[PDB]
Amino acid sequence: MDGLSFVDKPDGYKNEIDQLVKKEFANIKADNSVSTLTNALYTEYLKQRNNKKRRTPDFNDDDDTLFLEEYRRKYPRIDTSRYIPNESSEVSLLGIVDSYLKHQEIVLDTLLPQTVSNQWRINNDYIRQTCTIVEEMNIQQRKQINDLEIYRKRL
Amino acid sequence: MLCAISGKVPRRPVLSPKSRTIFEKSLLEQYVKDTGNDPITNEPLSIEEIVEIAQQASLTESIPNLLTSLQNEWDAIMLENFKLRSTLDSLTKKLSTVMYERDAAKLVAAQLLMEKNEDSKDLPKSSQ
Amino acid sequence: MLCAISGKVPRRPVLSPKSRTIFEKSLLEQYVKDTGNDPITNEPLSIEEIVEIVPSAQQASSIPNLLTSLQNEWDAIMLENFKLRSTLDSLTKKLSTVMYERDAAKLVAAQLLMEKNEDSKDLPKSSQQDFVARGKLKAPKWPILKNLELLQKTFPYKEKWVCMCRCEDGALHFTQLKTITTITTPNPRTGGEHPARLLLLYPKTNKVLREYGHNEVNTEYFIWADNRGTIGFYIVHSAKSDVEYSSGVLHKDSLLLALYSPDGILDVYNLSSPDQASSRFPEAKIKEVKFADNGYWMVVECTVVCFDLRKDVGTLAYPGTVTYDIDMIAYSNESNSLTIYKFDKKKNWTKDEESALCLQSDTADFTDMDVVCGDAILKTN
Amino acid sequence: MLCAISGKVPRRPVLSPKSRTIFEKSLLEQYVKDTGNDPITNEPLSIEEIVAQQASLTESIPNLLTSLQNEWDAIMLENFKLRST
């Protein structure tokens, strides 16, 4: 488990260890009908066609275009009424929503900092641990080398 | 400011008293009837337990609402969840490659733990 | 569609304008005449306070529910997207924690390897300072393959006939019409053979011609290898390896098997998944492989190399080996001659009676005898 | 966007779980320390009582469905003007 990141100051060693890990891997080796049509639409990459009729039409048609004509009138009157209540308020309704979006945005970036601080704070605690033990390991190795030659010089 | 189920910006937000989290009324009311518990914390919660607590500028070119806008909404719902199902499938596959490579490393360490200390032991014995 | 006094279907639904609850005109009127009150809330109410008769006027008796239906289906869409995302991010935590801990655990090895290495040079620099010939034809001489019936009976393949012979009576029980592989079914009445491109299943008759050979643990299936690069049970090859398979044997539990290759690999396969799960490298064509009944040893020849299947490591190498078989106390080899090794300490028997190549070796039950066949004799020891 | 007690733009909004209303933490905290209550409804509230799917801003599917209600509900009143007349 133990491998000191802060204390151990190559890419060759990653490439080396990857090969040894690789060799040990060589050894081991809820919705209704809605979901059916939605998954089929996405898989096939084709959206279902809508009513491309109101836009084109034609004068001196028949009973069919008499309907299609009368459709264009009522929707154009609804359109012109739908543009009236927008222009009445105008830009006040738009800029009121623009202000809401600024309150929504700043909240996210506050959380970006809260995460930033606690993430650096955890790493900060790790750092001290790394330097604590890395010294202790240094102490151990020095003592190790002392015996190694001490035992020889006695013999 | 958002709902904690769909990812909406709620029109009638309602907060639960067991876990302080704001949901849109329709979506929290649906969960309680499906299974009577809080979705996040899995704690007992009912419809009576809930406590009830926005402007969108309709575009200038607002026919399109029936045809173009509604079409885009069910395209965007369709191709996202399909792509999201694709993302979930790969995470489980990449999970299996993670755990296998992990256990492969465990065996290396275990194999090397026997190797190193016995090599060190042999140096201690050599002196004699 | 129910009154809130009797519980009947109201034919004249009248309502009190103090507590919203639709009653029937008869019952509410009898309650008001009894005592001037609303029956549900006990508030003040009179007869004139009640709104009687149906309401349809300037209204006319679709569309609105279609939008309601559109909402109801969306309500599911949101609920589904939530549970799909939870599992998405919750799995990403496992992915992230693993990958981090993997490369963390990877650095353990890099450190460990260099210290292990240091221990080597240090210490190194310091330490420095019966014989039956009539089973098959005399004019086309040679027995090329051998098996013994697991439940009792000898099976040989000849330089084109398959022969079943009884050691006790010294009689040929059947001559079944070169044969280079034979397998004896435990049922005693079924025998199998293979040759330079069929597998044949025999009763004194051939009952199937199926177009190395090993019997599955169940007794119901045969694994085969071929120079055509495929193994068969299904029929599969390795695109990547793409070469002749030289031998084939099931592991005793019947889940995995091994196939030797002309390019010196021992390929291990998962039968269920039909996948190549491991390959053991380390020269020339593989000639024979054998799984021990201990379930964790595999012996291979091309040297005889011993593999521990728990570690996937070559733990011993004994430097023509044509045939390998465990009794798991003993391992026999045959080819240039016959040799038997004790598996515990790795040679206990050595026979050189055959003239020319030995093509098969086998253990009688409890190792009470050994059998071998040669390029005409079948010998018992 | 506003704090209901002061009327300012709260720089640390915390929503209560008894009278659902967005209060400024520093303001509501003092209100609770004065007396354990919610300022609006005068129901009991303590300081602990106060409190993965990515969203996008509310714009012109659910907002589109509520739009079509406005369309039809307005057109239904248009019919009354001609039924009554």
UniProtKB/Swiss-Prot annotation, chain A:
It is found in: Nucleus. Keywords: mRNA processing, mRNA splicing, Nucleus, Spliceosome. One of its GO terms (biological process) is mRNA splicing, via spliceosome. It comes from the Eukaryota. The keyword Lyase does not apply. GO terms for cellular component: Prp19 complex; U2-type catalytic step 1 spliceosome. Involved in pre-mRNA splicing by stabilizing the NTC (or PRP19-associated complex). As a component of the NTC complex, associates to the spliceosome to mediate conformational rearrangement or to stabilize the structure of the spliceosome after U4 snRNA dissociation, which leads to spliceosome maturation. Belongs to the NTC complex (or PRP19-associated complex), composed of at least CEF1, CLF1, ISY1, NTC20, SNT309, SYF1, SYF2, and PRP19. Present with 721 molecules/cell in log phase SD medium. This is Pre-mRNA-splicing factor SNT309. It comes from Saccharomyces cerevisiae (strain ATCC 204508 / S288c).
Swiss-Prot record, chain B:
Residues 1-62 form the U-box domain. The chain holds residues 1 to 142 of 503 of the full protein. Residues 54-128 are annotated as: Required for self-association. It is found in: Nucleus. Disulfide bonds: none annotated. GO terms for cellular component: cytoplasm; cytosol; mitochondrion; nucleus; Prp19 complex; U2-type catalytic step 1 spliceosome. GO terms for molecular function: identical protein binding; ubiquitin protein ligase activity; ubiquitin-protein transferase activity. This is Pre-mRNA-processing factor 19. One of its GO terms (biological process) is generation of catalytic spliceosome for first transesterification step. Keywords: DNA damage, DNA repair, mRNA processing, mRNA splicing, Nucleus, Repeat, Spliceosome, Transferase, Ubl conjugation pathway, WD repeat. Probable ubiquitin-protein ligase involved in pre-mRNA splicing. Acts as a central component of the NTC complex (or PRP19-associated complex) that associates to the spliceosome to mediate conformational rearrangement or to stabilize the structure of the spliceosome after U4 snRNA dissociation, which leads to spliceosome maturation. It is also probably involved in DNA repair. Its main location: nucleus. Residues 63-120 are annotated as: Interaction with CEF1. Transmembrane segments: none annotated. Coiled coil: none annotated. Belongs to the WD repeat PRP19 family. Present with 11700 molecules/cell in log phase SD medium. Homotetramer. Component of the NTC complex (or PRP19-associated complex), composed of at least CEF1, CLF1, ISY1, NTC20, SNT309, SYF1, SYF2, and PRP19. It comes from Saccharomyces cerevisiae (strain ATCC 204508 / S288c).
